């Protein structure tokens, strides 16, 4: 639907994934932090190509599509919330309820037959761990846990992080994140020295194909993902050689980290333990449009009370955020961007020459193709098209 049929026909093992250029519909996605949206102050954002508006009323979040039903203008061009529970389009005053999107009034013509007979698209919104999740889908939403990695929602798990827009398709961000051998680009990260980490340069695989990963599709919660087990039978590379001569060495620090990595639909990575032996790293690559994504980074650390929460918060600002989220992950950002040209014409999905560790990426592509809840299409963006027969 989104890609030349000749290409989809070639990638028989994961065509749905290759076709999912706009992301997967019917999944929850984090788009901002709770503290970024204030009471009565609608905020705009684009998710899966759709312009949305989020507002907080009586502390609860509501989401309406930011596109008037009438002439298709963004209501946000000139926000007019004239009553607590509604928003009035600045153009011809069509008024909608945040609660159900129903066109309840039209100031330019209170006798219009459209009143009460049209409805603006709304999307479920849920806040968890100080993060704002939007269910970009149709029908009643599944539990949030289904689209989050294990432990993210733990009661004692304190979540902190940052978010930003990155210029690359979401899939390139995902594959880079789950890529076992990309650890090489982190060899000079400040976190390595400054946090005394043990970090190999790569991995010499061991065992059979099936042993390289653990595909999860029997999670009682419904979670669908893959675990990277390359380290279970492999031999970590600490001395890189060329022509038999050592030209590079891994990091021989004491802190053991990132020995438990997994990727979960709709596209969230869990690195454990990281950036420190007593922490976890959860990062989402949320589709904005075919060329961009939100790089939603979160770090979690169990905290029994305000005491620890405050301390954690302090270290997050002074150390973890600058040394890890940025000092470590920044290289991930330009790495993703570096793959844009090769895959931009969709040809990269055919011409890529993979090697052993990409077995982890293949497992993900297959899992995503088989368990996604829907392929977002441009028609979903402009307006579904069909001619029942």
């Amino acid at each position: 639907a989104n890609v030349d049929e000749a290409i989809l026909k070639r990638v028989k093992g994961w065509a749905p994934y290759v076709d999912a250029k706009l992301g997967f519909r019917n999944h929850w996605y984090p788009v901002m932090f709770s503290k970024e949206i204030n009471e009565g102050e609608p905020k705009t954002l684009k998710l899966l190509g759709e312009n949305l508006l989020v507002n907080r009323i009586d502390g609860k979040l509501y989401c309406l599509k930011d596109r008037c039903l009438h002439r298709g203008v963004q209501l946000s061009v000139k926000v007019e919330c004239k009553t607590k529970s509604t928003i009035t389009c600045w153009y011809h005053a069509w008024t909608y309820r945040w609660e159900d999107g129903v066109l309840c009034d039209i100031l330019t013509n209170p006798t219009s037959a459209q009143i009460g007979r049209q409805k603006l698209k709304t999307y479920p919104v849920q806040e968890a761990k100080g993060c704002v999740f939007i269910y970009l889908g149709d029908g009643d939403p599944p539990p949030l846990a289904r689209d989050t990695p294990p432990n993210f929602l733990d009661d004692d798990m304190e979540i902190l992080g940052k978010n930003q827009i990155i210029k690359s398709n979401w899939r390139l961000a995902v594959e880079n994140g789950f890529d076992p051998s990309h650890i090489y680009i982190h060899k000079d990260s400040i976190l390595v020295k400054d946090n005394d980490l043990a970090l190999p340069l790569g991995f010499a695989p061991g065992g059979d194909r099936k042993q390289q990963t653990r595909v999860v599709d029997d999670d009682v919660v419904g979670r669908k993902g893959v675990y990277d087990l390359i380290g279970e039978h492999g031999v970590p590379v600490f001395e890189g050689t060329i022509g038999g001569e050592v030209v590079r060495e891994g990091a021989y620090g004491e802190k053991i980290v990132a020995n438990d990595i997994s990727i979960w639909l709709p596209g969230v990575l869990k690195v454990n333990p990281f950036p420190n032996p007593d922490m976890m790293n959860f990062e989402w690559y949320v589709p904005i449009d075919e060329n961009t994504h939100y790089y939603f980074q979160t770090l979690g650390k169990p905290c029994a009370n305000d005491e620890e929460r405050k301390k954690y918060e302090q270290e997050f600002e002074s150390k973890w955020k600058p040394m890890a989220l940025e000092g470590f992950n920044n290289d991930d950002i330009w790495a993703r961007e570096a793959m844009v040209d090769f895959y931009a014409d969709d040809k990269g999905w055919v011409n890529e020459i993979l090697f052993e560790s990409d077995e982890a990426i293949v497992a993900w592509r297959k899992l995503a193709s088989e368990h996604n809840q829907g392929i977002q299409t441009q028609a979903h963006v402009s307006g579904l098209e069909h001619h029942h027969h």
């Binding site: 037959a113 007979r117 049209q118 307006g383 098209e385 069909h386 029942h388």
Partner: protein, 104 residues
């Protein structure tokens, strides 16, 4: 309870007939074969008159944007239409078509 539309003979199968009502919105009567059906005339997607549309079987296509509805059920048949059309009762008594002034 009922309004006199026309003689069943005045409508060739596959045609549409608009019924203007005093102090009320217009209705549309369609003849699909030897059966008659009726719905509100105004397309639920805008302000177009469906009686100015094209009938294909039991599906009426709106002249404005190509949206369509099943004239029997009033259910949308083609995008961009999404809101069900109001359906009205029709009776053919003594070679004459009657439409329920009230929607079922």
């Amino acid at each position: 309870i009922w309004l006199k539309v026309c003689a069943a003979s005045d409508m060739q199968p596959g045609t549409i007939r608009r019924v203007n009502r005093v102090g009320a919105a217009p209705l549309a009567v369609y003849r699909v074969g030897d059966q008659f059906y009726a719905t509100e005339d105004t397309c639920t997607h805008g302000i177009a008159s469906l009686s100015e549309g094209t009938l294909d079987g039991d599906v009426i296509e709106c002249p404005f944007h190509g949206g369509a509805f099943n004239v029997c059920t009033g259910m949308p048949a083609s995008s961009p239409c999404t809101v069900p059309l109001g359906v009205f009762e029709v009776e053919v008594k003594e070679g004459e078509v009657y439409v329920a002034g009230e929607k079922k």
